[PDB]
Structure formats: C-alpha cells, structure tokens
Design a protein around this ligand. Sequence first.
Ligand code: PC1
Ligand code: SF4
Ligand code: SF4
Ligand code: SF4
Ligand code: SF4
Ligand code: SF4
Lengths: 218, 172, 162, 198, 193, 144, 57, 252, 44
Amino acid sequence: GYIQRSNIHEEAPNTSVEAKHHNKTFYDPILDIDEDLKDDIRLYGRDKPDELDFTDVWESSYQNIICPEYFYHFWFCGIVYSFEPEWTINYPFEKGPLSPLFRGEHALRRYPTGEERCIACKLCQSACPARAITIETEPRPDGSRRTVRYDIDMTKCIYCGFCQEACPVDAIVEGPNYEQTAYLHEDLFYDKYKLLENGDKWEPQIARNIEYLINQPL
Amino acid sequence: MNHYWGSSNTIPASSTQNNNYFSGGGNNVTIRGNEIMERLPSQTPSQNMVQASMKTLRFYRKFCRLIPFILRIHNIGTKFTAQQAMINFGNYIRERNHYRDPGLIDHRIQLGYELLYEAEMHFSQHTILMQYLSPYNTPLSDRGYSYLEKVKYGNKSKFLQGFYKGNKPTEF
Amino acid sequence: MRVDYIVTPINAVVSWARQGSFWPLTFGLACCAVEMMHATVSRYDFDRFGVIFRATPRQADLILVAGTLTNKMAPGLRRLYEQTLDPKWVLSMGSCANGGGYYHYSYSVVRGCNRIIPVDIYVPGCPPTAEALMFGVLQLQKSLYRQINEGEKKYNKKDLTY
Amino acid sequence: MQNKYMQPIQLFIVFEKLNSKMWISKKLNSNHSIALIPSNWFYSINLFLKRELLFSNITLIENSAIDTISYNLETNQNDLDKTNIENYFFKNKMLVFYNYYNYFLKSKLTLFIILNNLNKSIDSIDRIFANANWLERETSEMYGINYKWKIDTRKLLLDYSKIENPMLKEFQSEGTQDAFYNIFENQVVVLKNETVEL
Amino acid sequence: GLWSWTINQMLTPKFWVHLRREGFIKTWTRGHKASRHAHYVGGNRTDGYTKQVGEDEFGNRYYEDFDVDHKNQRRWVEFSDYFMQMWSNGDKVPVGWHGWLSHQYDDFPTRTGNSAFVKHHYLKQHTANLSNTPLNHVPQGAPQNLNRMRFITAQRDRSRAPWQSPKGEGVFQGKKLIVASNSPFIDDMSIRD
Amino acid sequence: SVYGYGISRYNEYKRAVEDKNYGPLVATSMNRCIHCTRCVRFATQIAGVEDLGKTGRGKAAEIGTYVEKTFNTELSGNVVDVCPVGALTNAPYAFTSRPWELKSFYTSDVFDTLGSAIQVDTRGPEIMRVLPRIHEEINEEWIS
Amino acid sequence: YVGYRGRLQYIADALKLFIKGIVVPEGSNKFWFVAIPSAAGAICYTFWINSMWGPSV
Amino acid sequence: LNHLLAVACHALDVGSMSSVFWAFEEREKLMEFYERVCGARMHAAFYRPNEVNLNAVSSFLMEDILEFSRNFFTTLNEMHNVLTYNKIWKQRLINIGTYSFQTCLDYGLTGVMARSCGLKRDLRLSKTETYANYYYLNFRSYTGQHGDCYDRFLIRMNEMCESLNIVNQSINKISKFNNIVSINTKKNILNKENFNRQTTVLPHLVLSYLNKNDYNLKNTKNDYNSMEELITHFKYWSKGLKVESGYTYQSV
Amino acid sequence: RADMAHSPFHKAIHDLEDKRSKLFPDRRRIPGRKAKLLLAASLL
Ligand SMILES: CCCCCCCCCCCCCCCCCC(=O)OC[C@H](COP(=O)([O-])OCC[N+](C)(C)C)OC(=O)CCCCCCCCCCCCCCCCC
Ligand code: SF4
Ligand code: SF4
Ligand code: SF4
Ligand code: SF4
Ligand code: SF4
C-alpha cells in the first residue's frame, strides 16, 4: 500500500522440536484425516469417481432405509438442548444489563444551587440530526441569558445523544429511563416543564453516571 | 409477440379452449392481459414532432379504450361517466400541448403507459388515481355541491373573489 | 338493574381472556421490526404473557406498527387495519411510526401513522429496546383489561349501575 | 505508488476518434482510474469492454448522475487549475458516471459522460450489463434521465401515480404532497402539504 | 394464587426459618410479590433465604442472589402492590434502584448514613408513568389545556401585537377620539423642569 | 480554526476586565477585547465623536471612556459591526438569535429619505435584525 | 402469567376465540363459508367413538 | 451479528423453528457489547471521521468478549448439528439457485455470493483495497465449488468462526503477555497496586507508545480549560468540519 | 503466524494432552458399520 515489501511470502514458523515454541499435539492423527478425503472428486464439481464402491452402496442404503434424520436430530436436539437452564429475564421483576452510557429519556439539569445549567447557546439545536429541538431565548430580568422556550419533539428524536455531547455545561442529558410509553401523541411533545421535572426526578442516577464518566479520562 | 400487449396474451375463454372451436380469439385491448408485464422497453426515438404527436394520439386511444374497465374495477363509475373521464384526461393532454421536444414527449409517453398499467392492475388506489380523471371546473357526480360563492360573488371579477377570500390564515 | 348482576361479573371473564391471549399481527417494517423480533425471543418471552404472533389479520387482535411508513404503503396499512377482526388495538412503535422521525422532512414518508389509522399507544425510542416494547405491551394489556368497565354508569340508591 | 499500475489506454487506442482525458487521485484507491467519455460513443465503448480480452472479466459496480447546474466551489476558489476534473462541472447541465471493476487487471474504472441537452438523452447499456437495469431505472427516475434502448423504463423506487425527480437541486426535500386518510371517502388521498420549519 | 410455596419447596429449612422469623402472611405473599420461578421463592438456596439488599420509598424489597442458574437473574425486586397477575410493571422502580437493578453500578440508595447519591434541595420524588391518567403531560397550547389562550396570545404577540381598539363611550374633540396613552415608558422631557 | 495551531498550552490566570455601560444600544463584555483600535478609529474618523480611547499601559490597558459616560450618538450601533469580537454587541439583539438560523433579504429603508440599502435577517415569521449593506452611492457602509 | 404460573392459558385462548367477531367477505358463498366449519367440527367431534381403552371398553 | 441473523432467518423460512431462538440470544450479548461503548443496542453512531472515544473502551470489555467467543463456539456447534447433516436440509438447499462466475459477473454479485460462485474476492485481503488492520492479520477465507445455497450456508458458518479468530488476534495485539521476572530463580514479579495486575489487556499501549505527544494533549486539554479546544468544539457542533472539494469512492 | 503450527502468537503450547483428549472426540467414524449392523439386526 504505502510501504515496501521485498518478500511477500510469509514463511511458516520453525517446525523443529528444538525450537522454543514447538507445539506438540497440534496435529491429531485421529482428527486430522483430511488426506483420506481430499482426493474425492465429489468435492470439486458435479463429476463422479472412476469407480464406485460397496462403501458408497452401504452408505446410501443406510441413508435411504434407516432414515437416521428422525432419530439423530430428534434426540440430539430435544433431550440435550432441553436439559439446559433457561435464559429468560423476568422483566417486571428484573432488568436487562445497561451501562452508564445508556441513552434514554431526555432531561434538563441544574447546578447544586438550583440554577439552570442551560445558557441558551443553541449548540444542541444545531447538533440535532432530526431537527427535534426548538429553542427561543430572551434576557431574564436579572440579566442572565435563559431560554423562554426549550422543547423537543420526542417523535422526531432518534435518541442519538449528539445533543448531550454538544452541550458545554452538561445541561441537556439522556437519562436512564426508557419506560416513557404514552397514550397520546401530544404526551410526547416535551416542553421545558417536562424536561425540568425529569431532571429534578432523575438527578441522583444521572449525577452518579456522569461522575463516573467524568472520572474516566482523569 | 413476447410483450405484454402481444396478441397471444389473452385470457382463455375456457379451461380447455382459448375461444370456441374451429377458431381462436381473446380480448387484450379493453381489459388486462393474462400474464403480468415483466419489462417495458424504451419508446423508439422520435426524430420530429409528427412521430411524437402520433405517439401521444395512440397513448390517448389506449387510455380511452381502457377507461370502462378501470371505472368498473375501481368502483368510480358514479363520480363520472366514461366520456367525462376521457374529456378530463384530454384536458390534461391539452394543458400539455405546448411541448416541442420529441425526447421529452417520448419520456412522457413512457410515464403515461406506466401509470395506465398501474391503474389497470390495482397497483394504485382509486382515490389517488382519480386525480387524473377529475373535472377541472365542475363538481363530481357522486355528491352534492355548494354554490354559495357563486351567488354572493355573482358578477365580481376573479380579483375581487380572490381579495374577499384571503391567501393565508388570519388568526396569526 | 337486575341484568347487571350477571353482566358485571362476566365482564371480567371477558376481559381476562382477551388479556391472557393478546395475539399481534406478524408485520414488521424497517428495524423496529428487528427489535420487536428480539422482544419475542426467549430473553424477553411474550409467550409468558400469552402473546403469540399470527400471520393473518383475521386472527390478529393487535396491530403493531414497527417501522417507517411511506406514501407507497399507507393504503396497504389502512386496508390491513380495516381487515382485522374487532375488537382490535393498535400499537405505534418507534419514531418513524409515532411521527416522521429521522425522515420527517422527507418527500415520501407519512408524518406519523396516526394520520392514516387510529393509534392506542406510542413507544418512543429509535429503536425502543425490547424492555420498552414489553413495557408498552404490558401497559396496553392492563388498559384494555380495565377498559370494559371504567365507571361510565351511575349508581342508583341500591348501589346498582345502569 | 507502491503498487503496479497501468492506464487503460488501449480503450482510446481502439477508438481512434476520441480524445483521452484520465485522472488518478490519492483520494481514490491506488488502482482506480477515471476517464472522460463522450455520450455518442458510450454504447460502442461498453460493447468493446464487455468482450475484449483483459476487459471481458469485468463487472459494473455502480451508476449514478450529478446535477452540476448548481455546482459552486465554496472555499479555496483560487486553487483551481485547468487539469482539475471538477473544472468540467461548470456550465454542464448533467453528468453521468459509471464504475466498473476488472478482475484480470485488478482495476477500478470510472467513466464520466457530460449531458448538455435539455431532454437529457443517452443510450442505455442494460442490454450489455444486467446490472444496469435497476441502476439506470433509479437514476432515470431520480434525475429525469431519458434512457434510450432500455429493457425496462418503469419506475423503481417512487410512489404510484406521481411524476417527479426529487434528486434535482430545484426540488425541496419535503416534496409537494402529503398523504392523509379521508373520512368522506374512507380511503387515503394526497393533498398539498404545509410543513413545520426549524 | 394457590401454592405460592410448593410442597417440595416447603419442608426446606429456608421455608421454616422464614416462617419462624417473618410470619405466615409475609412468607406466603413472597410468591405473589415476585413470580420468577417456583424453586426461586425466597432465594435459590435451601439452607436459608436471601437477605434483602434494600427497601424502597414505596415498600418494594430488593434482593440479590449469587446462586442463580443464569447470570442475568442475580438481582430482583418484590413489589408492595401485587393485586393481579399482570399488574406490576417496570416503571415503579425509583431512580437509584433503577440503576442498581439494571446492573449499571453496584451502589444502592440507603435511608441513613454515607450515601453514594446526591440529595439536593430541589429533588422531586419518583413517579410512575402518568399517561392515561388525569395527570398526563399537556402542551401549553393543546385543546386539553384550559389556559391554552394565554400561551397562544403570547406567541402571536411576540411578532404581531394587535392595537387595542377603543371600547364603549369615549370623549370626542371634533372627530378625533381621545384616550390615554398605553406607553409604560415615561416621557421625562415633558416633566423634567 | 483555519490558520491556528489548533490547541493551547497557556495554563495561567487570564486578565479580567470590569464591564462598562454605554447605553441601551451597545452591550459591553470587555474580557473579549483584543485592543484592535477599530472602535476608536471609527468613533474618531467616521462618527466624529471623541469619547473613545485607550487608557493604561501594557496588558492592563483598557479600551473605552475614562469616566462613566454613555456612547450616545447617531450611527452608534455601527461600532458593533466594526468590532470583530463580542466585546461590543447589539444590546436589543441580545441572546435572542444565532447566525445559522436566519434567512436574509436585501431591501431599502424608508425611515429617512435616503434609501439606505439594508439586509433584513428573519427566523420564521419574526424579523430578527437589520444590518447595513454596501452601495458606495448611498450610506456607503453605514446606517443610522 | 395467565392464571397463576400459567395454569389457565388454554381456557383464556378458547374464551378469546369465542369473543372474537367473525366477518364473511363479499365474493364468497356465505352458506358454504359458514357450513364447511360446522361440518368440520361435527366430523372432528366423532373421532372419540373410534377409540379403545382396554378390552371391549 | 449479521451472519447469525441471516442463518437463523433462513432456517426459519425453510422450516427449522427453534434455531432462531439461539442466534438471537447469542446476538443479545453483542448488543450488550455495543451498549457498553456507546449506550445504544443497534444504532451506535460510534465511528467518527477523526475522533475515537478512547475512554469508552476498557480492559474489562475484552475479557467478556473472549468469554463470548468461547461460548459462541458451543452455540455455533449447537446450530451446526441440526442443519448441516440433515437430509431434509440438504434436499432443500443442495443444487438450488446454482450459478457460475459469468452470471456472478453479469449481475454484480459480491461477498458471500461471489465466494460461492467460485471467485476469490475479499476487500480485506486485497493489497490495494484493504483497510483497518486487516492486511496485517492472518485469517482464512472460503470459496465454494458448486455455487448453490448449501455453499452459502457453509461459508457463512465458517465466516463466523473466522471472525472469532480475527477478534482473538486483535485482542492479542492489544495485550501485554510478558512480565518482569526476578534476576535470580526466574520468578515473576507481579504488581500489587498497578492496574496491569487485574488483566493483561491494555487497549492504549500501542497508541501511547507511538503517538505519545498526541496522547498527552488529548488527555490534558478539553473544551473546559482551553480556548482553542472550546473554539473547535463550538465550530464542530455548530457548523461541522470543512471538507476540501473533491470526489471520492470508498468501498468496504 | 497465528494460523499455522508452532506459531509464537499461540499461547497454549505446553503439555495439554489431557485437555485435548477431554475436549475432542477420540474415535474415528468408519463407513458401513452402522449400515451393516442395523440391516443385519433388522432382518434377524
Ligand atoms: C359441493 C362441492 C363438492 C362436494 C364433494 C363431496 C363432499 C362430501 C362432504 C364433505 C363435507 C361437506 C358437506 C357438508 C356441509 C355442507 C352440506 C351441503 O353440501 O349441503 C348442500 C345442500 C344443497 O345446497 P344448496 O341449498 O346451496 O343448493 C340450493 C340448490 N341449488 C343447487 C340449485 C343451488 O344444502 C341444503 O340442502 C341446505 C343445507 C343443508 C345442510 C345440512 C348439513 C349441514 C352440516 C352439518 C354437519 C355435517 C354432517 C354431519 C357430520 C358428518 C357425518 C358424521
Ligand atoms: S446545548 Fe446545552 S447550553 Fe446550549 S442551548 Fe442547548 S441545553 Fe442550552
Ligand atoms: S438524541 Fe440526537 S436526535 Fe435526539 S434530540 Fe438529541 S441530538 Fe436530536
Ligand atoms: S423509529 Fe428508528 S430504530 Fe425504529 S424502525 Fe424507525 S428507523 Fe428503525
Ligand atoms: S472593536 Fe472590540 S477589540 Fe477592537 S478596540 Fe473595540 S472593544 Fe476592543
Ligand atoms: S465567539 Fe468570538 S469574541 Fe465570542 S468568545 Fe468566542 S472567539 Fe471570542
């Protein structure tokens, strides 16, 4: 590609018993019997061998009359594979394994003082591949820049996490919650009240996960 | 003829006979064929406007021949008669009269044949394909109509009618 | 008044049965279909809650829209909904079905399957994990169990409904 | 570079009446050659490719078209020379490209054709390569390309009862119609659309 | 719900220990609070029952057993509300217990002492899914909102505020109608000196 | 982004500057100033007012008026367009919008009988800001 | 979960199948459409007479 | 993942009902492996043009991947012994959909189908077309000699096995095997508090060895304590990166 | 070489005879044995 290669042939490793990395029992005479079967012409095309034999006669008679497919597979599947313990996770009473990186329901966070982290920078709005975030901003009477509107269409969202990566104050996050099934299409129109209460309810778990994620680079 | 319109692509009259004895026959013009269409080759290029006009006339003739079958199978015969549907599609073609590029006309004829085949094989929905057969300035025949704006804006010009009725919502 | 003495108990037996055997239609579009098929296999067994898939709409009780709906498919979805036997319920799974989704601004996609057929419940993710799909199906089962007697009738002086 | 490469120059040796314009780039694979081909020789060139030795073991990998009527350099406008292939994207109504792979020579070959007629007419090669049927159908429906001598001209991916070329630059990604259910007709209809904007 | 503890599961030392300590109603209902497996009631072992790792603000109990046949069944919760089969769903698990039960981390909430979770003054309590209830999420302009007009009017007035026309009887000077100005700002140059 | 090294190595305290009040049209964030003198030169040579300057020395020098004085003048907002950084910003146009979510139209002004060539930036049905254009026969580069 | 530990699944399935409301499409023979299932049920509810449980039982 | 789903669904179509339950359980573990690096089970959006989330990859993840490989051998053998030698399976798949290299070229067939028609075409093993460490590993590729459904099925199973082998080779390439031994008695000196005591896999040893300068800068400066990095973050997430004009074609 | 014998990339190189015996079959299938046995037994 971008380098030179004087010798393209990769030579096999040293086969001497004196060598340090000699691997005995790599080749098994019982198992490795490919020399017996490699000369068969049936493995190379539609052609037939020069001479058929009574071994083939016996094999065909066994296959056609005994019909082993009804006892080989039946036993070997049914009994043995039924002996194995089950794999089911009892969903109402157990949960499947997640990670702190799991992308679930969106939430808006606060500082430990109770102040909003979001400063209406609109980076999350432009980061959204689905155009699901709409933001409008006015100066709050105390002077700080805050959103007068921050809403996300959860029926447009693809749950990709580009917005939580774009946020420079960790204001918008995707929480661990996934049980957000709704009965109305209007219940999935998330406004600032919904995201704020989601953040105020899920703050401990989100804080723990974000703490671990922050400590990972450190 | 190895084509969907071939003279041998007719549905047999009976299970043991293509037609009555002593002869053969079948209908392939006013109804669909026996086998499905598997390929639709390109129209032979037209070197001048005469060939393009002939192609348009022949496509319109095929469409007119297929109208009653489409109306029956799509249950749209009460909205308009066969002649009304032909006249509406002729209005469409007349609105496409100003064309003067033969290659563009060949492309349009290919598309028209494709849409006609879609209509005659239940590929499209009747409420969707009726957009080509609907009248331009007349109500449909399967329902009543309102003539309120005819009475109030009787002798008023088109501008006044479009001024009294706005072009945008008024709440916002 | 006296008819309720028979109707009110029997109602439960009618609901329980249809809550115990809730057969959805075998129909999957795009990749919420793959997620749903994951939700059907042994890790999350719908067969635990008596949910088994039937291939024809005449034997189906729940229509599960689980993928993108294009303008080419809307009449087919409408026909499939109309051809299911009553009573029936509709579950909308994933963003492409709940709304436009990742293709909301496209020229050939229906902006939500509820523009064509009524929807009973929406599952938001893209894709919603098998956890969330099972949650939504269980919620729908409980709702349709309770849906036969929601207290619509008034009680007279004998504590009897109408 | 660091591999054996040779231009596909025999193609223009056999077709003695054609100009030769070829490019190689480090943005492509080191065995990928791009050439410019006139439209009125495309069918004969594909006929030669399909059967000539050291070309016969070839397959058609991809086909598509570029709407260059709105192609503009956005940065570094002063770093363009007369040898840049993008220099052929100006003033040209349409472009069509085909990509093949040759197993004997282990090479990628891309051919570019400039369409400068308003009807966008070009001969089809689906009678030579069986790939070109669906590929050319999709290209024709997306970009309005008029393919002549084609096996099948029907629409491939677009909706029934509609005529449009959504991949042209003039087309807005939201289209012009929306599909709704109509209670008064108990079936789905299409209406002029009003859409949200971000 | 008969035989929450089967006969084979009974006669086990675990069952008698649980009955002696916890009682009958608590022991019997453990088969109804969780319905994982017949042999799993009270824990997979037989010498004793699994100690609960914790409890809940709504009464749910959380256990972790390391002797389960499959790795995924290590941790589970028994709910305080078990009225019917197919009654308790997965949205009833609170925040820290959600992460513990989904194996995100190995920390779990504690009532008292050194906690691994923040306890701020603005935190709200976990609520279950409130859809299909009178307390669902309503957009500010949706028809379900009784105060939808205040939101609609403000959005309209952001870019086009209508002029308030005079109403009722007014004062006339010829043909001009006299009203007081609506400016909240002060014309200080007419009062200054 | 285009010409710099792309990463930093400065790891000390930066200087901090207290903000000044110039009036309801110009907002000041003087930590962002790069001492480019564009505002001083615009005020002296274009606006004709002599209220701006550079006081101090070295890194601690500051741009602006020495005393608490408003930047009251016509063509005042133009100085914002001159300043390359967010040191001086359009105070009415504070925090409301971002450049990428605006559509622009070319038109002419009617507030004064000079038909100033202007650019109107809108977001949906709301007009968000007005900027000057280049004509060289009307308003040069500037608007009132 | 239908009953306790799934002890009534068949009962629930049978009751739901009773509850479901059948519709006969147009273009089909209604008499035959309803009569073939009746004949099939009558035939299938006869197999139990061709059974043997011990000698001459 | 893909070959598991394909084989299971093909068996389900043919009539083997149970095999789909197994491949879906064994592809749940790979979905968990996705979820542990990006937080999603299907749509990762993981690969980036010039950025790699190095912190998302830990040594504890590779050991679980090796465990999965060891058990995937057994699950693949379980699927093997109900399909491969089954008479019904052979009579359903053998000599079905047979084609040669000429059709395989006319219809642009690549991948498993092209290896079944007999053609040796693998982009990973091509000298001029390889990508992402594939050219410097050692694995096998399989071609059929009949061009039918049976060949495709066998090729897919063998490709799954070879994928296991490639994963093992990569983990070995990011592993630290040799240790420090005592000068006398040739006895190993294992660390007590170092992270390398927990496991032999260090997924950052090659990167830190060669690109030490870039490793240091990335681990010290972010958009919270550097002006250049904050400007880069803002431009990247507001307008995106700028790409110089040109045409490219890239295949995988 | 990781795909050929005696490769230094391989790790399990020392005496693993017991594990190799336990994990893998120790007898070779011989054609006709089952056929002849089953046919003769069925006839008898
Ligand atoms: C006709 C198609 C080809 C038939 C091939 C031979 C079929 C042999 C029988 C297979 C089973 C289906 C037949 C039974 C159901 C339909 C009855 C029928 O054909 O009626 C036609 C006859 C005549 O059909 P018709 O009334 O529609 O015809 C009107 C007259 N012409 C022909 C001019 C239009 O029906 C009647 O006379 C009225 C309905 C009587 C139905 C009585 C039986 C109902 C089913 C009871 C259960 C089955 C019997 C008991 C169980 C079995 C024995 C243990
Ligand atoms: S990305 Fe973060 S800081 Fe920016 S507008 Fe959004 S929530 Fe606010
Ligand atoms: S997760 Fe992705 S699609 Fe969803 S709101 Fe955030 S950026 Fe948009
Ligand atoms: S909502 Fe998303 S994940 Fe679901 S089917 Fe649609 S595209 Fe696939
Ligand atoms: S334009 Fe800005 S950086 Fe330049 S001198 Fe003025 S306040 Fe400073
Ligand atoms: S946007 Fe400009 S003036 Fe504002 S802080 Fe960033 S780089 Fe400086």
